[PDB]
Amino acid sequence: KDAWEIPRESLRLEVKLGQGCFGEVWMGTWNGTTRVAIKTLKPGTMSPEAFLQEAQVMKKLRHEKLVQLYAVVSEEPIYIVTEYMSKGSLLDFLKGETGKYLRLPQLVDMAAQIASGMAYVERMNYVHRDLRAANILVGENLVCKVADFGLARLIEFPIKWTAPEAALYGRFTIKSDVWSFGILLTELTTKGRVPYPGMVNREVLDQVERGYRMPCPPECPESLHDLMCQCWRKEPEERPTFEYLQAFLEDYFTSTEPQYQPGENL
Numbered sequence: 001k002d003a004w005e006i007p008r009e010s011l012r013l014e015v016k017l018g019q020g021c022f023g024e025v026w027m028g029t030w031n032g033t034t035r036v037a038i039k040t041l042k043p044g045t046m047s048p049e050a051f052l053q054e055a056q057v058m059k060k061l062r063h064e065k066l067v068q069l070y071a072v073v074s075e076e077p078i079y080i081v082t083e084y085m086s087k088g089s090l091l092d093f094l095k096g097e098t099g100k101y102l103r104l105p106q107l108v109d110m111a112a113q114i115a116s117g118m119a120y121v122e123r124m125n126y127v128h129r130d131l132r133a134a135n136i137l138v139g140e141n142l143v144c145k146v147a148d149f150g151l152a153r154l155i156e157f158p159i160k161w162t163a164p165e166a167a168l169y170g171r172f173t174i175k176s177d178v179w180s181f182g183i184l185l186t187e188l189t190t191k192g193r194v195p196y197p198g199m200v201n202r203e204v205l206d207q208v209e210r211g212y213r214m215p216c217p218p219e220c221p222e223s224l225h226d227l228m229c230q231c232w233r234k235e236p237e238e239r240p241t242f243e244y245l246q247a248f249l250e251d252y253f254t255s256t257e258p259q260y261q262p263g264e265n266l
């Protein structure tokens with residue numbers, strides 16, 4: 001065991017946030033001072049080793065725009081402990097009561113933050129492999145953080161968010177994350193709508209390999225849809241870096257859309 005271990009007794013669960021087929025997620029407190037999120041093991045439901053690989057990844061990654069690992073407890077019951085993101089997933093946020101008030105300036109900034117965290121992922125030679133709005137967490141002041149590193153891996157599957165070469169041939173790279181980032185941009189510009197509306201998984205894969213790409217979202221400026229389409233280039237190496245994405249989105253309203261006016265929804 002390493003320096004991430006803590007004593008269970010210093011963890012107290014309070015408020016339930018969700019369950020799955022491996023355990024649960026609770027709000028809670030740490031050493032009676034610090035608000036945390038705790039992720040639990042339904043003890044015999046899965047191999048605790050592989051249940052903690054999500055923490056092994058989080059130990060190595062540390063960035064302001066990635067959700068921070070706080071501690072692990074490697075003896076049953078088992079926990080992972082992280083900072084607490086007050087507004088939950090970005091997906092829920094966008095669909096929620098606030099989502100409708102968000103306009104393009106806020107959505108591009110959020111996407112800029114996510115790109116910033118992924119740019120870090122990029123230069124660390126990792127791939128996330130599950131980038132999408134459901135796996136971005138939100139705090140106050142519209143802070144967005146990449147989360148859920150379950151499938152994340154040092155570089156050595158829902159087709160809607162996954163690049164083709166990765167879904168078909170298992171070729172996951174930082175460039176298939178770039179693809180997913182392009183899909184995530186349509187989640188932001190639609191306030192959370194599922195991609196490829198009205199298409200089932202098979203139709204998505206068939207159409208995407210046939211060159212089909214989602215059209216420009218209502219009120220989304222074409223320059224932002226260009227960006228999406230660059231993220232969705234057939235050739236992975238011709239997709240932009242997270243470094244380009246971050247800088248492009250940070251400067252967006254001066255360098256690309258200086259004449260932007262708000263409309264009905266964006």
Ligand SMILES: COc1cc(Nc2c(C#N)cnc3cc(OCCCN4CCN(C)CC4)c(OC)cc23)c(Cl)cc1Cl
Pocket residue numbers: 017018025037038039054055067080081082083084085086087088089137147148149
């Ligand atoms: C601990 O370990 C892990 C925890 C997580 N997941 C979370 C992390 C992290 N990280 C941080 N913060 C979280 C906050 C949540 O909900 C906040 C309250 C919801 N409300 C919506 C309605 N409004 C009005 C009140 C707020 C939440 O809900 C499910 C999950 C969280 C992941 Cl993904 C992986 C690991 Cl290993």
